[PDB]
Design a binder for this molecule. Sequence first.
Ligand SMILES: Cn1cc(-c2ccc3c(c2)[C@@](C)(Cc2ccccc2)C(=O)N3)cn1
Ligand SMILES: Cn1cc(-c2ccc3c(c2)[C@@](C)(Cc2ccccc2)C(=O)N3)cn1
Lengths: 546, 546
Amino acid sequence: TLRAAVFDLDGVLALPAVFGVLGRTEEALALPRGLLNDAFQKGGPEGATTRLMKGEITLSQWIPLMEENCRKCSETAKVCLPKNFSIKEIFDKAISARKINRPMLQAALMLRKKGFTTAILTNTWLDDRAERDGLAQLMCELKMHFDFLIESCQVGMVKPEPQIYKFLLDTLKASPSEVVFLDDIGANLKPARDLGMVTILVQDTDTALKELEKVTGIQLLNTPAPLPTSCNPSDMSHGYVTVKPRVRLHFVELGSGPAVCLCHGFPESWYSWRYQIPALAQAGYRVLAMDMKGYGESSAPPEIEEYCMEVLCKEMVTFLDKLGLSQAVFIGHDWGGMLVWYMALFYPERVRAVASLNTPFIPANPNMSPLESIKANPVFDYQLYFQEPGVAEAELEQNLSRTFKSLFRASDESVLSMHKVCEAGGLFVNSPEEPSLSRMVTEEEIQFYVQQFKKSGFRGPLNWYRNMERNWKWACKSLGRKILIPALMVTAEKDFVLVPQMSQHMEDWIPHLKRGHIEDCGHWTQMDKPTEVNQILIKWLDSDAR
Amino acid sequence: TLRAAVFDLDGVLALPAVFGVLGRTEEALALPRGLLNDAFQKGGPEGATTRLMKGEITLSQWIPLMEENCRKCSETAKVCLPKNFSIKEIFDKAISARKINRPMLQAALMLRKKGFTTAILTNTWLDDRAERDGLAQLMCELKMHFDFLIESCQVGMVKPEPQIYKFLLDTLKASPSEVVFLDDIGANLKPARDLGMVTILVQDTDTALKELEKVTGIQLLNTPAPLPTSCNPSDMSHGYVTVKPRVRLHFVELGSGPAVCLCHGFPESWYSWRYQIPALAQAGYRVLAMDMKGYGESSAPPEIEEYCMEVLCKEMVTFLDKLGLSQAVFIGHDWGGMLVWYMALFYPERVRAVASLNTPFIPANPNMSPLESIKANPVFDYQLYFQEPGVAEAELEQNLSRTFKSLFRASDESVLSMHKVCEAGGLFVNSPEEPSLSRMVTEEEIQFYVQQFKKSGFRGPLNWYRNMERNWKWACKSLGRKILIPALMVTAEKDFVLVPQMSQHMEDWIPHLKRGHIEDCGHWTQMDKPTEVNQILIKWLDSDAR
Ligand SMILES: Cn1cc(-c2ccc3c(c2)[C@@](C)(Cc2ccccc2)C(=O)N3)cn1
Ligand SMILES: Cn1cc(-c2ccc3c(c2)[C@@](C)(Cc2ccccc2)C(=O)N3)cn1
């Protein structure tokens, strides 16, 4: 019974295969058949290519050895190579063209999810070309999805030599019969077959995948659309910045490029962005996913005034100051979306671009108290219950697993009334003691939130709602301003509190505003519809945030 | 007696003054004298400009109001404005041209060093222009050097109104006689004078500075070259990445742009890069200053093999993997310089560029044991003393303050023999029990290193030297390779262990190698010669690392 799957890189996990470009160049240049593929394999196990694949020499050192082999091969076949012939140009283009074979990666991901140990086994080189980064990026994206990556140039062994196979078996800690081995080269497949391993000669992906599902007994072809890559908390880079004597802000950091600061809502975590972090980093951004003040590993002082928008924004400015960032794009959800609009209004010089999920920008009415405005809409009545210090804390901290299981549900999974909460005596009245698990979250994901809220509880989080008068007074100073920096408003059809129609007049204050809209999406936007969120954010980032 | 200094921004801390561009435009366009400066101040305290400076409106909203004021002013003077006249273009260029007035900043820095409370008090606007980032960057660089930054548009008060002055006094928590106030506008200087504050009308910097030193009794003009900005540990963003179950790596992070990974030597810290971090971040880089494995807040496992170059490099690759970085430029000193050369040899796809301070790249001799090679040079004899587990640990951990005070000294300050160490019974034999403080370090800086080494001691650090045979065997696999990615070798004239002449044959392996050389520089390169290090690194980064 199989428990490990092994994939080659060239022609298996990545396409078009770099090997096939030798035959393509020949046909394109009307050269004798196999001329380039012959110069490539010249000398066999003692030749330039084997030395390159074993790591004896780098790619830049092999280029002149390949050029000389091409001269020797054209001499024997009695022909002449063109004027502007370049091996570097041919390989630069072939490497650049080669992309991840998405269905093969999906099959490998599915096998690992079901408990398989997966590995990439590849004959590769030490790339020192000026353009080496493109391959480095490709290898990085791929490797993180597998238990092992075995490169010939790092182990000093090469396929089809039998040592690399016994080495593969040793790293897998499995007997040959427990291993499936996929390769596009028959000769390289041969020693694994001869050892007792299940083998698949890969030509077209579809047939290779049919052979793979037949032998593993796991459906890999025509499978439902997979969720985006998530985050394992213990595998992240964790960052800590003291913004003032009693306040430190924690964040998770991934990627390179323009800084993108993700600001969660209530009662959340940096982890609420788990499906966005790998996707935004892969799209070419440096993601900083915050634990907002009052949450997770960030400081949670008790004082109400420590959570007014003025203080929170000032601290986010200091956070950038301390990290040495002149700007960041600010993306917020719920209370984080409110912070992000005020960052744009008060510190436009520090905001590269602004995006909000669900939270609209609504200007302060200076002729009406916020308490009056909130009372007009019965949708916000539950926030009156959050006003009295200690009341909501006691109920929300009573049973954490119940709190999060009840809150984090899709639009059709509602378990909480969320109307007449302040008049029924609680948020959890006529709510199950043991809610079912939502289709949005695993038990493990709920337990992460439970573990985070064990440190500071709900006081700091609830304080974000206790500054209505202070926030309103501050917001009134900005009434003559407009938001003229790049801005995105993302509405969620089924958020019944932060309704899409609340965003309707935003163009009056943000004339250049761009929009996104997600259908059949509830309040917990990022985990409800992760694929669409990522699609919307990446598209806007690439067009408006550089 | 004075204890607080206040500076304006436009015409005082930053030059050329944005105000002076109205008079320059007039002369350049042969328009009536004061025409633009008149349209600028139209309406006085009720006008467009006052509303802008108080934060009622943003810069992008004021532009059309200024255009209309320019039309009304040209009408009265009976003239016509040119065809391609643009207020936006005029202000975009004026803002872009305005740079920090370095001698004024130096004087403010010196005043703060002597115990003064410093503040910037400025009439400014909420910048929402597409090019707002240039000013955001300027404000960021400046503000971090002062105790307070008071902006008119944030406080809703403006100079010369008396409220802003009483507000300034309230924030400074000082009486008017304790405050010096510098401004280029006489009218704005007036209320501070009338309140009892010492005032300076700023025209040319030199005279303003003469007036400033006369009144404070502190030398500010013709003063020695100041050291680059250092790091306050508590003000940094601290990052944490688990690279494997028992290993987490800590780093300090500052700036935006290409990732620059700084790797310290033995027995150091991320703090050894204190003078480089603010300068590299200000030069447009995202600095990641590591605590290398075995040091500070990073994990320090006890096993010797956990510190071989292979393991350390693999972990630095995983560190990049976890942060979502496809590459970083790697800059190392001492043992960090050795790691950085091996990162270039084994993972060129992950290395944007490589730079080493003092440590040369010397290829492994496969016909000679490293122990044989080290014995040939009496300079490396002290490393034989580091071999026996527990021996050097006991002596180096006996008195931490003594350890660091004895080690961290300039070339002429030597207090340790560092020859026949292994034959004299110790590193500290015939060395003072209470060494004097080196000119390179303050007591506070030594105590930082003392505090860091209290967590794990010298075991993990010493283990970096205990993998000679393993490192040599690993290095032999790379003998056929060359380093063809961008590379910098920085030699220090007076490093008597890592001598400049040891780097002489490096071009044989790194043909495209660039160089730097620092005269009168000992082993502790970064703290010995910080200005030259920064100059050399920034110049190479900008030309070779993008
Ligand atoms: C129209 N509308 C307002 C709200 C609303 C609800 C709660 C809170 C607020 C507004 C502010 C941001 C205070 C605030 C109120 C009004 C304007 C600006 C800021 C606050 O601190 N908490 C919902 N609908
Ligand atoms: C010529 N020379 C070598 C050294 C030298 C000194 C100490 C150590 C080493 C080399 C390596 C890196 C081991 C190593 C030795 C030789 C070649 C590669 C690596 C090590 O692990 N520790 C100084 N001069």
